[PDB]
Amino acid sequence: PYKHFMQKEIFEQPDSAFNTMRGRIDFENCVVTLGGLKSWLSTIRRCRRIIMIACGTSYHSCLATRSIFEELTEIPVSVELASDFLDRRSPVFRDDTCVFVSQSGETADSILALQYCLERGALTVGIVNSVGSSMSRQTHCGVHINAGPEIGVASTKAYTSQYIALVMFALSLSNDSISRKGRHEEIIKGLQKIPEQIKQVLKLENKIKDLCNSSLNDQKSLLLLGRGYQFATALEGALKIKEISYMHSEGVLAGELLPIIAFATRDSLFPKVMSAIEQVTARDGRPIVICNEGDAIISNDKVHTTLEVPETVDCLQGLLNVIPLQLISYWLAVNRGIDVD
Amino acid sequence: PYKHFMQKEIFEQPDSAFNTMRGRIDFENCVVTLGGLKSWLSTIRRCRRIIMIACGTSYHSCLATRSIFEELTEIPVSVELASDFLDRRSPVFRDDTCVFVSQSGETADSILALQYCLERGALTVGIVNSVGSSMSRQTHCGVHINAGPEIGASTKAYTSQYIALVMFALSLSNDSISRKGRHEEIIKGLQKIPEQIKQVLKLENKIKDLCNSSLNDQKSLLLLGRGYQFATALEGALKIKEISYMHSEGVLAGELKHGILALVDEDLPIIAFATRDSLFPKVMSAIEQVTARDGRPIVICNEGDAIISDKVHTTLEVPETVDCLQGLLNVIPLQLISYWLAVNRGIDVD
Amino acid sequence: PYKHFMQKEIFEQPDSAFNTMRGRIDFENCVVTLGGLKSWLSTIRRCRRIIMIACGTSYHSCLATRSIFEELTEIPVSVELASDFLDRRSPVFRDDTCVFVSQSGETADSILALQYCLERGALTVGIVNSVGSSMSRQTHCGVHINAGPEIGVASTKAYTSQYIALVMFALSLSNDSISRKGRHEEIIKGLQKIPEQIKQVLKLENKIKDLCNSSLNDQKSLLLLGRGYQFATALEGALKIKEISYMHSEGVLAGELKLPIIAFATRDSLFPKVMSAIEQVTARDGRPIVICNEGDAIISVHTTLEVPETVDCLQGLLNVIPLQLISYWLAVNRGIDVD
Amino acid sequence: PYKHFMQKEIFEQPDSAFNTMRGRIDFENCVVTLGGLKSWLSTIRRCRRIIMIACGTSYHSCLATRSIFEELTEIPVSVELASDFLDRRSPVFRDDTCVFVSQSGETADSILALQYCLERGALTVGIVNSVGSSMSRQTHCGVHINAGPEIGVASTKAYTSQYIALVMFALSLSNDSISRKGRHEEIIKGLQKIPEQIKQVLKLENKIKDLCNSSLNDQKSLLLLGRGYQFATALEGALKIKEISYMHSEGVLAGELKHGILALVDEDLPIIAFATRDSLFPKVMSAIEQVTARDGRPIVICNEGDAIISNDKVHTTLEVPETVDCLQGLLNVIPLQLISYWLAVNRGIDVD
Numbered sequence A: 001p002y003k004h005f006m007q008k009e010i011f012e013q014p015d016s017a018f019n020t021m022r023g024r025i026d027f028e029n030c031v032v033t034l035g036g037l038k039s040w041l042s043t044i045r046r047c048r049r050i051i052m053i054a055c056g057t058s059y060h061s062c063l064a065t066r067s068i069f070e071e072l073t074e075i076p077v078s079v080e081l082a083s084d085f086l087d088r089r090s091p092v093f094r095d096d097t098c099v100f101v102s103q104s105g106e107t108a109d110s111i112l113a114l115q116y117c118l119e120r121g122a123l124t125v126g127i128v129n130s131v132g133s134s135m136s137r138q139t140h141c142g143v144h145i146n147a148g149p150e151i152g153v154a155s156t157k158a159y160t161s162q163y164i165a166l167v168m169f170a171l172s173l174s175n176d177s178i179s180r181k182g183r184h185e186e187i188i189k190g191l192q193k194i195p196e197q198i199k200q201v202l203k204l205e206n207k208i209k210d211l212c213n214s215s216l217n218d219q220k221s222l223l224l225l226g227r228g229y230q231f232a233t234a235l236e237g238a239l240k241i242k243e244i245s246y247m248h249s250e251g252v253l254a255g256e257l258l259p260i261i262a263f264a265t266r267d268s269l270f271p272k273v274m275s276a277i278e279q280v281t282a283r284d285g286r287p288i289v290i291c292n293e294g295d296a297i298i299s300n301d302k303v304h305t306t307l308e309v310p311e312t313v314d315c316l317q318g319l320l321n322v323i324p325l326q327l328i329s330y331w332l333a334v335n336r337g338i339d340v341d
Numbered sequence B: 001p002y003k004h005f006m007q008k009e010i011f012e013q014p015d016s017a018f019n020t021m022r023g024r025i026d027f028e029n030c031v032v033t034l035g036g037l038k039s040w041l042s043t044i045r046r047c048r049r050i051i052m053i054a055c056g057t058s059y060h061s062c063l064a065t066r067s068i069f070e071e072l073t074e075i076p077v078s079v080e081l082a083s084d085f086l087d088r089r090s091p092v093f094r095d096d097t098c099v100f101v102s103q104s105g106e107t108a109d110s111i112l113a114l115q116y117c118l119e120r121g122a123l124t125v126g127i128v129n130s131v132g133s134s135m136s137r138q139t140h141c142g143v144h145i146n147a148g149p150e151i152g153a154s155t156k157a158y159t160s161q162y163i164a165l166v167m168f169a170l171s172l173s174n175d176s177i178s179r180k181g182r183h184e185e186i187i188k189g190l191q192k193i194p195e196q197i198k199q200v201l202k203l204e205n206k207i208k209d210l211c212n213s214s215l216n217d218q219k220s221l222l223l224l225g226r227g228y229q230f231a232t233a234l235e236g237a238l239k240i241k242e243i244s245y246m247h248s249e250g251v252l253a254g255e256l257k258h259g260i261l262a263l264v265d266e267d268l269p270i271i272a273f274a275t276r277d278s279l280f281p282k283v284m285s286a287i288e289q290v291t292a293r294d295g296r297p298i299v300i301c302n303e304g305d306a307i308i309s310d311k312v313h314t315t316l317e318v319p320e321t322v323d324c325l326q327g328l329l330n331v332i333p334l335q336l337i338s339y340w341l342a343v344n345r346g347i348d349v350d
Numbered sequence C: 001p002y003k004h005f006m007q008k009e010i011f012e013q014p015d016s017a018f019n020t021m022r023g024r025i026d027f028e029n030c031v032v033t034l035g036g037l038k039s040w041l042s043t044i045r046r047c048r049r050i051i052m053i054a055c056g057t058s059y060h061s062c063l064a065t066r067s068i069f070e071e072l073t074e075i076p077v078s079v080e081l082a083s084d085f086l087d088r089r090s091p092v093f094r095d096d097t098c099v100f101v102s103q104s105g106e107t108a109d110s111i112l113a114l115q116y117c118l119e120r121g122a123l124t125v126g127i128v129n130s131v132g133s134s135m136s137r138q139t140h141c142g143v144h145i146n147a148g149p150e151i152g153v154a155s156t157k158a159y160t161s162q163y164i165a166l167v168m169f170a171l172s173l174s175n176d177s178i179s180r181k182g183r184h185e186e187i188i189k190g191l192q193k194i195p196e197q198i199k200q201v202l203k204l205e206n207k208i209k210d211l212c213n214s215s216l217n218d219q220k221s222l223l224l225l226g227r228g229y230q231f232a233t234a235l236e237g238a239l240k241i242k243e244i245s246y247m248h249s250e251g252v253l254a255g256e257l258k259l260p261i262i263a264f265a266t267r268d269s270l271f272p273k274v275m276s277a278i279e280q281v282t283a284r285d286g287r288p289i290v291i292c293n294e295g296d297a298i299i300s301v302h303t304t305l306e307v308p309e310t311v312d313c314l315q316g317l318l319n320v321i322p323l324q325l326i327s328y329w330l331a332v333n334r335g336i337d338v339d
Numbered sequence D: 001p002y003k004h005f006m007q008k009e010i011f012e013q014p015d016s017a018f019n020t021m022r023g024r025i026d027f028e029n030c031v032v033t034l035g036g037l038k039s040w041l042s043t044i045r046r047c048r049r050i051i052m053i054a055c056g057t058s059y060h061s062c063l064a065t066r067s068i069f070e071e072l073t074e075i076p077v078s079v080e081l082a083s084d085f086l087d088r089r090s091p092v093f094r095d096d097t098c099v100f101v102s103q104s105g106e107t108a109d110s111i112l113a114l115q116y117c118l119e120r121g122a123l124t125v126g127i128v129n130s131v132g133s134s135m136s137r138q139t140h141c142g143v144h145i146n147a148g149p150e151i152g153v154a155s156t157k158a159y160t161s162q163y164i165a166l167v168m169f170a171l172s173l174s175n176d177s178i179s180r181k182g183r184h185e186e187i188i189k190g191l192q193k194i195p196e197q198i199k200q201v202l203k204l205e206n207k208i209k210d211l212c213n214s215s216l217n218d219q220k221s222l223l224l225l226g227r228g229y230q231f232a233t234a235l236e237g238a239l240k241i242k243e244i245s246y247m248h249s250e251g252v253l254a255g256e257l258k259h260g261i262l263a264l265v266d267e268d269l270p271i272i273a274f275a276t277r278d279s280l281f282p283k284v285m286s287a288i289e290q291v292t293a294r295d296g297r298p299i300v301i302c303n304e305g306d307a308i309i310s311n312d313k314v315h316t317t318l319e320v321p322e323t324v325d326c327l328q329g330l331l332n333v334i335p336l337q338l339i340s341y342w343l344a345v346n347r348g349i350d351v352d
């Protein structure tokens, strides 16, 4: 009963998030098992550093999980846009583990980056959706994310499934640490609840439809403010708004230096986020605030819109925070007469 | 003779570039000596990775030099914005060399990041303009860039930082036979930089005309860049934002086919870096995409180059230098653009 | 009651082994806490490699524990004799952790080696018995082995306490590993029983006095055969016989190549090549002295010295004791004043 | 003309040393080129550490060149005996470069160690004489040392050819260093002279024959004292004496123990000391004085013209040309090969 494949795929996320984890997480014993990697983990872990390489929304899923990889593994992790990585002729060597994220497994720049790394003797790992695609075959090992086919022209469920697979990879790499056992358990217990929480967040759609019916839909640009874990969410929202809604958007690191969406969930509620919000409300700017259920980020003596989402484990919050942006980008396009498919 | 300190500081760059290099480069024998790091180089060469950490324009000078560091040293180099590095609580260890770049040597987020790295046992290196400032005192070793005071947003500090960082990369790679020719190339290039900066500064009249005829009334402008000139595009955007109080965004040229450029107005000001060092197919496609929609791009390119036709555009020509140095010349017209946009708006840039 | 200090210090080892562990191992919870290293462990784990540097018997305690360091930490471990390390001018860097083992903390080549590594920016760790000695002060961090003063001329209790301290250091480095938890616990429970097992091994003394009253004390050379964990023990037994008994001795890697002989044949190091070497000796009616675990029959004429079975990597602590007593009684029989 | 293949192989070393270097060293321009390692050098360097693994005399060739590998490359280098490496189950990983030195390419413990390292993801490099042997096939890359077939039961020319190949490997690894160029040129010019210097050393055979017919023949044991570069040579001399001459021998780190074996030796115990300038340490001189003070009459291997022991006190000298310090072992080993050979002939052993 969906208008477009994009809307269908947004609403499939409870199922795709569940399918990504299926048969890979023992939620009772708190054990992650990635069959595709299991013989390789000890080698993956013995590298000088990890380089995540991807394009577009897949590059965003790398940004969204970089912190949790560095936290859990204590291996340096850098995140590269495949085209820029190639542009700079970035040296890579036998001691590098290069992790390629791609829904299609066919993106030309990701393929060229893969071949470049392979030629230089690096160990390569694919986080891929299309089973047996080029990137899937040509990487040494990997995880098929099992999101199902993506027929929309923009990444929705691929993003949240990539992000989950990447978190499972980080957990897998760090499964031998006693000191990080509590953190592992917390994240694993949080993952179990994500699919039902995504269902809850999808219930924002009517509020989001009301917002996109407003003069929000005739704006020439929309800025998204975020920091920490939620900066990747800001960049991904802005990509979706440009690509889907044909509206200019920019994801801005909040407070570092027209409608505004600010991420103010607890995981990323920094003093600089508060002061950036306060700057907008000082000029009576009417921001749209994504925050956790029950938190009053702005008092009622300032006009603002709130989009409340469940609180999850800090490094998983982006899984839920992205959903309203996917929905906004979709409804803005529909109100603007755009066929998003 | 100058209306503002900012204008003085821009015009000072041939002299500040020369003073940054003074006593440090033997241009005849192609040898770089940085006294403050001399004895620490073998230790820096040895680390797991180099993390460059800075705020604002100093963060851009790190982006502008990341590639040549990687190329000359084959040591991994990442570039972190000080506040974001602290927000992610990025792990740092004894085997990291952390390089802190700061004009003032006093920026709170840079000092906080320094303290975090010191506490974790990392080796710390300062690239600082204010001698004996907190950052200078608290780093293990470093290079005072010797650019002189800034009373103006960073202009001569950016070029001097970028030069100091290039000198640092050359020092780290001074024992390599295979890199000897690339070293010589860059050092001979550096020798010519101060006079080429003098040359680029001659664009100011063309720039004042362009601001008076196409830019003053504008609300936003976009900068397109890729490779070595992506940092330049980010820095130009920051200058335009901070100095001129106009919206600006640096855009990775041609990365998105259906991104901002598929969205732009016909009259929106767009500056493209199209110097030979960063003249990628994706840069040409981006320019095309503007040119077909009847935008008239402002093309920064090398002297004599014909980047586009028939097709209406403004050209700002700059001398060709070594690829990894071209950003030193390319930033200068953006400094001048941002300055003139601001004064034509009654804004006090000092 | 003891005839010599060396004899007293051998017999003191149940107590010095306990004292070395005292306040540092929780045996019910299987937790090792070394207060000297507490805040430095995370840095030591980070390094490119560990270099253990020492002289004489202290060099042997590094060979004796190299394998367990490697096994538990997965960090490359090399073992260097201080003088030879200096002789090769072996390069050292910021990313090396250099571990210095010294009873006295004053040995000239060990000091010169420490100063060399310090100048080169390495992280330095001392395993030292004399509190506040040069090596204790000048290392960045370390563990005082708490063996008490050594008055005897040769290292006895210092060897076994060094070896225990080094094992505790390996356990501390690997205390964050889930996969090594089982092995950790095994080694910790083993360590708990070491002092009482040393008491038991000391009861071999009469058997060893009988052996040293024989024509064994009139021999020109004594060969010690070992492999694996027990190769260090063979080297240390050879050193003791030369230095105390004034009898030539060599520790030989058993059966590597194609006269009294002592063979280490405890279960931890009972390789095919050891059994082959032993069979070569018996085939020529050589009459070996076999050190082996209580109840084991290694050969069906020979002398057997039985020692309790402990965890493989701790067996060296018990196997060295009969060599200490053999070297001591051979000396007494040969009229040498060991003190 | 030779009595035995072993004698032939010893006297063949000028030719085998030349053949190992042939087509690999430009002595004019000081360039080392090892085709087998060509495009692997940048990868070999990019490692946490180098592990040299071998058995018997091949393990000695690794000990003899460890110091120069460490000096030229600044990569950690450890040397392991293949059987002991296996006994310890020493952990090996993807970031290790494991270098296997083997004349035959078929020694069981070296092959087992290789399989262990291969399955753990390490990069493996063979320094092998028998072309297409198991070790040569199974390593990722390597250098065939080109010594020619070795028919004698004990390694002679394979030792000096292995040692030379390992030095060439060390030079290849460090060929991009400006600060190393002078040391590289010094060693390469040294190497060019080694074949003719080996011929000079072989002129010692008459003196050695005489010595092996002496009161030396009747003794049951021989100690060798060495330090630094020449410790490997002392160990290799001891192996040759044990394995060929069937006499007890031990190589001793000279002057390490003030009251070790040297305080126990009989007046007439045969002792060879290496006292060439590259390894002429104060402790070596101390060890030598300890022997002569007890009326021992040592055999001194020293450089042409050097007076290590006063002519007042009764000692034998075997003089060898001086070469670059890290190459002196190539010359110092020759008299031990000849001594082991003639001791054996004088005792009736068939060395073949």
Ligand SMILES: CC(=O)N[C@H]1[C@@H](OP(=O)(O)OP(=O)(O)OC[C@H]2O[C@@H](n3ccc(=O)[nH]c3=O)[C@H](O)[C@@H]2O)O[C@H](CO)[C@@H](O)[C@@H]1O
Binding pocket: A034, A035, A036, A037, A125, A126, A127, A128, A131, A135, A136, A137, A139, A140, A141, A142, A143, A144, A145
């Ligand atoms: C593709 C396939 O047959 N998967 C099977 C696999 O799933 P399982 O989840 O174990 O494995 P994946 O589908 O993730 O990976 C399949 C293989 O492809 C490799 N790989 C994967 C992605 C990538 O980008 N690069 C890459 O090299 C992996 O290393 C692995 O060898 O076992 C399950 C039974 O337990 C089956 O239900 C799945 O049908």
Ligand SMILES: CC(=O)N[C@H]1[C@@H](OP(=O)(O)OP(=O)(O)OC[C@H]2O[C@@H](n3ccc(=O)[nH]c3=O)[C@H](O)[C@@H]2O)O[C@H](CO)[C@@H](O)[C@@H]1O
Binding pocket: B023, B034, B035, B036, B037, B125, B126, B127, B128, B131, B135, B136, B137, B139, B140, B141, B142, B143, B144, B145
């Ligand atoms: C401060 C000083 O006397 N500098 C002198 C020094 O300059 P030189 O250029 O050699 O050294 P710098 O001024 O760059 O640095 C001075 C000291 O500060 C340290 N440092 C520097 C910057 C930093 O951020 N952190 C930090 O720790 C350096 O390691 C060094 O120990 O020799 C020159 C002659 O060749 C003189 O003309 C300079 O006046």
Ligand SMILES: CC(=O)N[C@H]1[C@@H](OP(=O)(O)OP(=O)(O)OC[C@H]2O[C@@H](n3ccc(=O)[nH]c3=O)[C@H](O)[C@@H]2O)O[C@H](CO)[C@@H](O)[C@@H]1O
Binding pocket: C034, C035, C036, C037, C125, C126, C127, C128, C131, C135, C136, C137, C139, C140, C141, C142, C143, C144, C145
């Ligand atoms: C010397 C000292 O006062 N030790 C005290 C310490 O023992 P504890 O066992 O905690 O500490 P150690 O005696 O092993 O070491 C003391 C200090 O010396 C350093 N160190 C040690 C050896 C070495 O070779 N190099 C080196 O630098 C350590 O890093 C530490 O800072 O706390 C105990 C109470 O909890 C006290 O009973 C001990 O008296």
Ligand SMILES: CC(=O)N[C@H]1[C@@H](OP(=O)(O)OP(=O)(O)OC[C@H]2O[C@@H](n3ccc(=O)[nH]c3=O)[C@H](O)[C@@H]2O)O[C@H](CO)[C@@H](O)[C@@H]1O
Binding pocket: D034, D035, D036, D037, D125, D126, D127, D128, D131, D135, D136, D137, D139, D140, D141, D142, D143, D144, D145
């Ligand atoms: C055996 C062979 O055909 N050698 C040829 C090789 O000599 P060149 O000296 O170049 O190479 P080597 O004989 O040393 O090595 C031959 C091949 O075997 C490999 N390798 C070698 C030893 C080892 O232990 N492991 C191992 O994998 C090498 O990486 C190489 O691929 O090219 C020359 C052309 O210039 C020819 O004159 C030689 O006839």
Ligand SMILES: O=C(CO)[C@@H](O)[C@H](O)[C@H](O)COP(=O)(O)O
Binding pocket: A055, A056, A057, A058, A101, A102, A103, A104, A105, A106, A107, A110, A153, A154, A155, A156, A239, A243
């Ligand atoms: O779908 C989008 C955005 O909604 C594109 O940005 C892709 O994310 C990018 O082209 C990478 O594609 P894959 O490599 O993941 O197939």
Ligand SMILES: O=C(CO)[C@@H](O)[C@H](O)[C@H](O)COP(=O)(O)O
Binding pocket: B055, B056, B057, B058, B101, B102, B103, B104, B105, B106, B107, B110, B153, B154, B155, B238, B242
């Ligand atoms: O001047 C500017 C931009 O022109 C500021 O954004 C500074 O670059 C930033 O505040 C860092 O300052 P320093 O740490 O380099 O002193």
Ligand SMILES: O=C(CO)[C@@H](O)[C@H](O)[C@H](O)COP(=O)(O)O
Binding pocket: C055, C056, C057, C058, C101, C102, C103, C104, C105, C106, C107, C110, C153, C154, C155, C156, C239, C240, C243
């Ligand atoms: O005692 C012995 C042997 O029984 C000597 O070999 C010492 O072991 C050596 O002199 C190092 O002494 P320390 O550095 O441990 O004090």
Ligand SMILES: O=C(CO)[C@@H](O)[C@H](O)[C@H](O)COP(=O)(O)O
Binding pocket: D055, D056, D057, D058, D101, D102, D103, D104, D105, D106, D107, D110, D153, D154, D155, D156, D239, D243
């Ligand atoms: O030759 C001898 C002694 O002269 C043996 O010690 C071999 O050196 C050893 O068996 C290794 O054999 P290879 O691996 O080099 O073929």
Ligand code: NA
Binding pocket: A135, A136, A137, A138, A139, A140, A141, A142
């Ligand atoms: Na694959």
Ligand code: NA
Binding pocket: B135, B136, B137, B138, B139, B140, B141, B142
């Ligand atoms: Na300083």
Ligand code: NA
Binding pocket: C135, C136, C137, C138, C139, C140, C141, C142
């Ligand atoms: Na200390």
Ligand code: NA
Binding pocket: D135, D136, D137, D138, D139, D140, D141, D142
């Ligand atoms: Na091969």
